[PDB]
Motif scaffolding. Structure first.
Motif, PDB file in Angstrom:
ATOM      1  N   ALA B 314      21.581 -15.690 -79.505  1.00 40.74           N
ATOM      2  CA  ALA B 314      23.031 -15.747 -79.012  1.00 40.74           C
ATOM      3  C   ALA B 314      23.985 -15.818 -79.996  1.00 40.74           C
ATOM      4  N   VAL B 315      23.815 -16.785 -80.877  1.00 42.84           N
ATOM      5  CA  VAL B 315      24.683 -16.965 -82.101  1.00 42.84           C
ATOM      6  C   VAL B 315      24.670 -15.627 -82.889  1.00 42.84           C
ATOM      7  N   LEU B 316      23.853 -15.079 -83.100  1.00 42.84           N
ATOM      8  CA  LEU B 316      23.867 -13.972 -84.166  1.00 42.84           C
ATOM      9  C   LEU B 316      24.620 -12.775 -83.577  1.00 42.84           C
ATOM     10  N   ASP B 317      24.321 -12.628 -82.307  1.00 46.97           N
ATOM     11  CA  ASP B 317      25.094 -11.669 -81.567  1.00 46.97           C
ATOM     12  C   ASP B 317      26.636 -11.847 -81.661  1.00 46.97           C
ATOM     13  N   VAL B 318      27.060 -13.155 -81.318  1.00 48.88           N
ATOM     14  CA  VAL B 318      28.513 -13.508 -81.492  1.00 48.88           C
ATOM     15  C   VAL B 318      29.124 -13.207 -82.961  1.00 48.88           C
ATOM     16  N   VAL B 319      28.233 -13.618 -83.970  1.00 47.60           N
ATOM     17  CA  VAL B 319      28.679 -13.492 -85.284  1.00 47.60           C
ATOM     18  C   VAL B 319      28.863 -12.228 -85.479  1.00 47.60           C
ATOM     19  N   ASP B 320      27.761 -11.352 -85.357  1.00 55.62           N
ATOM     20  CA  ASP B 320      27.764  -9.948 -85.764  1.00 55.62           C
ATOM     21  C   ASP B 320      28.939  -9.359 -85.036  1.00 55.62           C
ATOM     22  N   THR B 321      29.061  -9.392 -83.700  1.00 60.42           N
ATOM     23  CA  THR B 321      29.981  -8.727 -82.679  1.00 60.42           C
ATOM     24  C   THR B 321      31.394  -9.151 -83.383  1.00 60.42           C
ATOM     25  N   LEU B 322      31.756 -10.382 -83.510  1.00 57.37           N
ATOM     26  CA  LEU B 322      33.011 -10.833 -84.052  1.00 57.37           C
ATOM     27  C   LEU B 322      33.331 -10.273 -85.628  1.00 57.37           C
ATOM     28  N   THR B 323      32.393 -10.180 -86.348  1.00 59.00           N
ATOM     29  CA  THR B 323      32.663  -9.427 -87.732  1.00 59.00           C
ATOM     30  C   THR B 323      33.209  -8.093 -87.492  1.00 59.00           C
ATOM     31  N   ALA B 324      32.438  -7.245 -86.709  1.00 57.65           N
ATOM     32  CA  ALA B 324      32.852  -5.890 -86.584  1.00 57.65           C
ATOM     33  C   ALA B 324      34.076  -5.540 -85.686  1.00 57.65           C
ATOM     34  N   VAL B 325      34.327  -6.392 -84.692  1.00 53.25           N
ATOM     35  CA  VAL B 325      35.585  -6.647 -84.252  1.00 53.25           C
ATOM     36  C   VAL B 325      36.732  -6.717 -84.820  1.00 53.25           C
ATOM     37  N   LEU B 326      36.744  -7.737 -85.727  1.00 50.34           N
ATOM     38  CA  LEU B 326      37.793  -8.256 -86.559  1.00 50.34           C
ATOM     39  C   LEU B 326      38.677  -7.051 -87.513  1.00 50.34           C
ATOM     40  N   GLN B 327      37.446  -6.578 -88.111  1.00 51.06           N
ATOM     41  CA  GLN B 327      37.507  -5.479 -89.046  1.00 51.06           C
ATOM     42  C   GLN B 327      38.135  -4.038 -88.220  1.00 51.06           C
ATOM     43  N   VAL B 328      37.643  -3.765 -87.012  1.00 49.25           N
ATOM     44  CA  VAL B 328      38.323  -2.622 -86.298  1.00 49.25           C
ATOM     45  C   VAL B 328      39.601  -2.984 -85.757  1.00 49.25           C
ATOM     46  N   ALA B 329      39.887  -4.075 -85.492  1.00 46.36           N
ATOM     47  CA  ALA B 329      41.304  -4.637 -85.038  1.00 46.36           C
ATOM     48  C   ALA B 329      42.133  -4.615 -86.282  1.00 46.36           C
ATOM     49  N   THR B 330      41.783  -4.865 -87.417  1.00 43.39           N
ATOM     50  CA  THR B 330      42.709  -4.825 -88.366  1.00 43.39           C
ATOM     51  C   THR B 330      42.946  -3.592 -88.709  1.00 43.39           C
ATOM     52  N   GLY B 331      42.038  -2.794 -88.750  1.00 40.25           N
ATOM     53  CA  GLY B 331      41.968  -1.246 -88.881  1.00 40.25           C
ATOM     54  C   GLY B 331      43.175  -0.587 -87.979  1.00 40.25           C
ATOM     55  N   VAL B 332      42.945  -0.722 -86.814  1.00 42.00           N
ATOM     56  CA  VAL B 332      43.888  -0.364 -85.780  1.00 42.00           C
ATOM     57  C   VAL B 332      45.391  -0.765 -86.052  1.00 42.00           C
ATOM     58  N   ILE B 333      45.570  -2.159 -86.190  1.00 32.60           N
ATOM     59  CA  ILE B 333      46.911  -2.565 -86.675  1.00 32.60           C
ATOM     60  C   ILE B 333      47.704  -1.889 -87.818  1.00 32.60           C
ATOM     61  N   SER B 334      46.624  -1.665 -88.875  1.00 32.45           N
ATOM     62  CA  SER B 334      46.985  -1.170 -90.294  1.00 32.45           C
ATOM     63  C   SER B 334      47.447   0.355 -90.045  1.00 32.45           C
ATOM     64  N   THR B 335      46.715   1.027 -89.213  1.00 33.79           N
ATOM     65  CA  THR B 335      47.059   2.656 -88.986  1.00 33.79           C
ATOM     66  C   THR B 335      47.791   2.990 -87.996  1.00 33.79           C
ATOM     67  N   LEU B 336      48.149   2.069 -87.131  1.00 32.69           N
ATOM     68  CA  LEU B 336      48.851   2.659 -85.861  1.00 32.69           C
ATOM     69  C   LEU B 336      50.324   2.994 -86.216  1.00 32.69           C
ATOM     70  N   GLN B 337      50.652   4.151 -85.554  1.00 39.00           N
ATOM     71  CA  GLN B 337      52.086   4.444 -85.731  1.00 39.00           C
ATOM     72  C   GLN B 337      53.030   4.126 -84.542  1.00 39.00           C
ATOM     73  N   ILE B 338      54.121   3.665 -84.840  1.00 35.57           N
ATOM     74  CA  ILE B 338      55.270   3.368 -83.824  1.00 35.57           C
ATOM     75  C   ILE B 338      56.321   4.432 -83.486  1.00 35.57           C
TER      76      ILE B 338
END
Lengths: 453, 445, 443, 444
Positions: B314-338
């Motif tokens: 249960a906790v490995l899934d949460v930490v692995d998922t959270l780690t990947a999501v944070l990076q993908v989110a940072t990516g989306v915010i960094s490269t989006l165009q308004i």
């Protein structure tokens, strides 16, 4: 089909019930008093108008306490009811209180104000429960009983060690409750509809008047977030989990089969025909309440998941959810305190549960101290239990001659091993069940409790 | 029954604890040598052997069988294969019950640092973009309906403060994670007067557990970490919803990079926000783990039982998922165009009717009157087939003589937004203040 | 304290009528068992009808003293008939009364939910039949994909709700299994006639095992579970209409009865009704999670834990009942803006059809797609739309194109391709409406 | 990163076979629709069986380069049939493939689960028939209440599990509804014969609406929901036996296969298996909660959110499958300790039967209870048990007592009172056994 027109009353019964809205009347009166003073300072209200306004609100406050503050379905919420009532005893001036103020900021403010007060009450009852456990542990520190693993007798332990484990867990809940309080005291009032207050209101004055530790940094977040609600419930859920486990422990220990404890008549029910039967109604109630609280946690998270970063009717579900949790938690902590302070331990049954076999590990630890490797020491004590077993007796009744055939390391002092007191006294390392460790635990907890100020 | 093994924690999950279980074993060995259970000579062999196993584990060649049921047993067998009989001494007075709680906490201690770094990076990104695009003005919503003009940066900063609260909660969790339970034995504590303080030092822990029964049977640190992870995900699920709506062609306020969306050759206009939808759905995955562990702990005895085993996966899934999501989110915010132009057009004249009311308020008229008056103006404009921004000063005087020449300053999306100077509002000075404050909190973390 | 820890009075009072109804059946059976004389049965039956009379005027009370409704009914009888009333408890237990009363209550609750569910579904199909010619953009990933009939959209929700309806029907049959006559745990020790109880209470059957009948709450769990998935369906419908009702999309407009506005912003219609509906999914799920946790890991017998079932299931029925009626109102009074739906229908949305056209001309799909993509690109460079390309333009891409390609640029021809069962073709949608009307004919 | 967030290979591989079958069925429908020639069909089919026999030896490597099993199968088809493989995708979408495959798979999974659930139920009833004579104390609030047949207990679980079996059957009907032929969202545009797809895939019917068929995951929620209630039942059974296999209670002893011991504590029998079964209830509940939250509030169309259904439902089927087999083994190999159960039945537990005696003698229940209450109190004061009171002593309390009152002090007579349907009377227990055997046989 279904054509009602431009109202449809059925949708009104889906909103917060009036009994719930009434619970926020006082905090809404205080919030408005603070806002009024801020408006006068911003030159929106004259001193004369402020005086008529503060006087009217005070009057409404008295009505709420007397429980005579009337609210109709047309007043969809307590904020509206209170504005109506002010206009009723003060006239048109009342309408100036809502200058630059939005219902969006009122509800979050009022809720936070109410919880700031509720957490304090919860906290008080929590500490009493912890103090009750630690003190009872200090008093019954001489009691020894069997310790379990997989609900199977493993070795002798001090009953106080058991009580202290729960006290320690509840102390972590206490700590989490304190951390949540710091975030609840962040005042969102003065955020307007979404962009903030447009009249240069003095939010620092609002914070001071309302006794809040700080003010929200961003207006959009202040209006649409319900983190404080989620945390509180989350913290309350883990606490309930702890109590559900203690309830389970006592339900088992209170069975006639175990006979380790007996509940007071105040926290149990019996049969006139079966005067021995004592139902742990109180513990079953506590255990089941863990589900009710968790249910509120699941509900609120589902409500917040995936909705836009703004205000929407969805957020309305927070009131019933938190109020239910605070009332449940409050009543539950009090019942738990009662159960623990008035229960009776049956020292007799505890000892009789301690058979000699439970000391076979100490028998191997003895050899280990003589230099023998653990693997060899283990198998040695194993032959002892096998030998006594064949000789139709218990290990404590094995002559120094019987043991001598198993290993020459068995001296005369080996008899000291067969003592429940010597057994529990081996664990002197920090956290163990030795009388000295237990005493240190009690001291550290007393200090922690004191630091809960 | 072999099927019993099937319900047990998977081998790929057990392998995740190899490194920490080894570090915990070295520290314990140093503590045994001090308690005189191990000779200085025995200590060297053991330490050297564990170092070798630590090496195999890093190269991914440490084999584990179904018979070893957990990583702890695999490590012991391997040490024995490398050192022989001496290896067994390492388990003197130690229990399987305490090894698993110690290993998870040791692992979680590392995980949190990683998560925190990426969390901070996501927040800094939002704060930094907010500063750069501080002059963009878009429509603000309530109930997903245009309410009033607002600065785009104010929007980004709202998500930024919510995320900082998550950051703060992660810090509080970490303090309880770093409490060492090693030395609690099977239940009553360690029976050989082991020096737990040494262990704490050798393992970089902040303190040691006070009660052995609790230290072995509690999983508060697990439920606490998942709760924090859950609220954090809820925030990202809300951010995903906002961006999915803003990236529709109907709204057209933002456009994702090709890196975080998919498209069709037959439809160039179509840009699917796969990354956002993925992030939104992960909120459920993490919540699922929270509900799982809570139900596992509800109503079971205050001691060790096999029920606890569900914690690892249960906790490995949460930490692995959270780690990947944070990076993908940072990516989306960094490269989006308004799309400034589109945000501009969406700002219609009607959206200022409220400022028209606040204009009269500042002139002394009661809020109630001001709204009515402003409501008359919005209707007058209708019955003229024109917007309110272009009503003759005569047309206003008819509503109220309070309308002066300076009433023309209201018809400015910039003057509108600049009214909110109180702490937390959209005024530039206020947004700048928020950025400065978050910029510092970041440092202090 | 129990003043707020025990089951609320407002909830207990709702079990008044069925408890009385259950007590009347027991009394009759007690008389058949010779525990009651013909005269004692009349007195008890008489008093109970009196308590029912009072309950018909909100008269019957309770106090913290009266832990539950079962105790209040008993107290009222005694103080209205004499010690004779105490005979009614012979061999009867509270354990079986509570689980019996609840099942009796839910039996009628399901019928109410069911009636409202069907009205919603009927409202959706009939509307679909009237607006069967409206065409709008279809979406995937909230991005326009292709032309689709608005009715196809309405029917997608109607068919989902029918699966909910079907599930409610399956739960119903397990709810009508009478547990009365199970005693404290081992059954009734007076050789009571349970078949007489079943017929009197109009139940379909009786429990097989006394232990199970007393300690199981399956019927509570699956009723809430079915309610939860149904609410998940309404939460998705709410999201759709919230998006479609924004000014940016502008496909629908809610009536004033389900919207909130402002005088300063005449174009602002808040979808409060849809937002409330969406959050109730959370509220119902919350009741599911709670009961599941209450039941997990407790012994197979009666315990005070079971008490939590009452509040949870009633909140669900009340919520569900209101939500369904509100859902019906929204769907029957909302307005579609055909002009906005058509304007959202742009030429590029037909690029996929252009490929199918080639496929029908014998070209393999992969190539037909690359061919259509070229046409798309060519249109951009020329600054025009795909439907404005000349036949020479198209022939330069593939000589397979012909004069009939012009038939491809019709939003109507586009949706008329999907004649296969379930598609958006008019004939297909018509078949869905007919079949659903057919299904709705199940009482 | 964006990919470490996608379902894992081993999960996608579980769908190789069902995807193969769905493709063969689609190919046949294509040829019939005149998109493929009678020749092209043969090429594709042969290539699909090759991959089928290929996944037979586990020769198919997902490569991780492929985003999902559908893509891997399309790539591997071209690799041995050529460009003709590409024609298989005509009018077909990935959106309808994922749901079709999941349903095809669950249709077979339900069958396996069903097989093991019934075996468990049969084991409980047959043992209930064998140990029908053993009597033990019955509990309420975990306090001894009255004598009860141990077989009554076992049957209470069998009946709960039969309710799960019934629910499993109703879920199957909705899972065998074929969504293939729904396209991207508007349906299939080439007038394909969906009826042909249904019979070729051995499904019960086909979806009525393409939008619903593509975006709904009801079948997933239903299965997990049913699986959750089933696990709740087993978590309660685990609780029962854990308490009963305790030394203090000593009514049950688990075989070595489902317990762990100690060489030092030969008395230690850790109920590992039962503890394992108790915690899986949470594991399954978690999957339920996760999916319900994934579906809540999202648009009525296809989106990436939906991809979370695979891992969740498979974890549930694997868990149920294993847990039921372990549950069956525990029940079939456990040992009851008749002596301990028997010697636990105390005379005090018959005080209620004493009251019934008087009720059958015509005494009002309330008076009958206060009477037995006096007997209970009189016995105490004298320092003896209730069954040792003399007629004289009893008759002073009430003349209605006779010499036959002695029968009341038999645990056998006690349990034989509950002859009404569903009671613990021997004839009632047997009746129950007969009904379940016929209910199990009905499963055909």
């Amino acid at each position: 089909g279904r054509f009602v027109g431009s109202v449809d009353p059925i949708m009104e019964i889906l909103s917060s019930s009036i009994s719930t809205e009434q619970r926020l009347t006082e905090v809404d009166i205080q919030a408005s008093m603070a806002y009024a003073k801020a408006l006068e300072k911003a030159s929106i209200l004259t001193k004369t108008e402020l005086e008529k306004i503060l006087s009217g609100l005070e009057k409404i406050s008295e009505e709420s306490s007397k429980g005579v503050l009337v609210m109709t379905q047309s007043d969809e919420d307590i904020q509206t009811a209170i504005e109506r009532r002010l206009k009723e005893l003060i006239g048109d001036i009342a309408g100036k209180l809502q200058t630059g103020r939005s219902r969006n900021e009122q509800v979050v403010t009022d809720l936070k104000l109410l919880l700031k007060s509720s957490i304090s009450v919860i906290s008080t009852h929590l500490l009493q429960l912890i103090k009750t456990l630690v003190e009872r542990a200090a008093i019954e520190i001489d009691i020894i009983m069997p310790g379990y693993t997989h609900l199977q007798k493993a070795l002798p332990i001090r009953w106080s060690q058991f009580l202290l484990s729960h006290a320690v867990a509840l102390t972590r809940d206490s700590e989490r409750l304190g951390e949540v309080k710091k975030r609840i005291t962040v005042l969102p009032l003065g955020s307007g509809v979404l962009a903030g207050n447009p009249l240069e209101i003095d939010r620092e004055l609002l914070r001071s008047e309302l006794d809040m530790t700080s003010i929200t940094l961003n207006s959009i977040d202040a209006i649409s977030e319900r983190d404080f609600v989620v945390e509180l419930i989350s913290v309350a859920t883990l606490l309930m989990i702890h109590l559900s486990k203690l309830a389970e422990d006592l339900i088992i220990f209170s069975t006639t089969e175990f006979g380790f404890v007996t509940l007071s008549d105040a926290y149990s029910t019996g049969s006139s025909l079966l005067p021995q039967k004592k139902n742990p109604d109180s513990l079953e109630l506590i255990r089941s309440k863990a589900g009710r609280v968790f249910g509120r946690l699941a509900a609120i998270l589902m409500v917040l998941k995936g909705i836009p970063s703004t205000f929407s009717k969805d957020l309305q579900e927070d009131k019933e959810a938190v109020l239910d949790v605070v009332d449940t938690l409050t009543a539950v902590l009090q019942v738990a305190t009662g159960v623990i302070s008035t229960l009776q331990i049956n020292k007799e049954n505890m000892e009789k549960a301690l058979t000699p076999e439970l000391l076979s590990t100490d028998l191997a630890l003895y050899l280990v101290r003589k230099g023998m490797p653990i693997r060899q020491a283990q198998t040695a004590s194993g032959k002892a239990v096998h030998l006594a077993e064949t000789k139709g007796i218990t290990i404590n009744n094995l002559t120094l001659e019987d043991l001598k055939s198993i290993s020459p390391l068995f001296a005369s002092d080996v008899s000291q091993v067969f003592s429940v007191v010597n057994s529990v006294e081996q664990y002197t390392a920090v956290g163990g069940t030795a009388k000295s460790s237990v005493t240190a635990q009690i001291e550290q907890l007393r200090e922690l409790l004191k630091k809960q100020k």
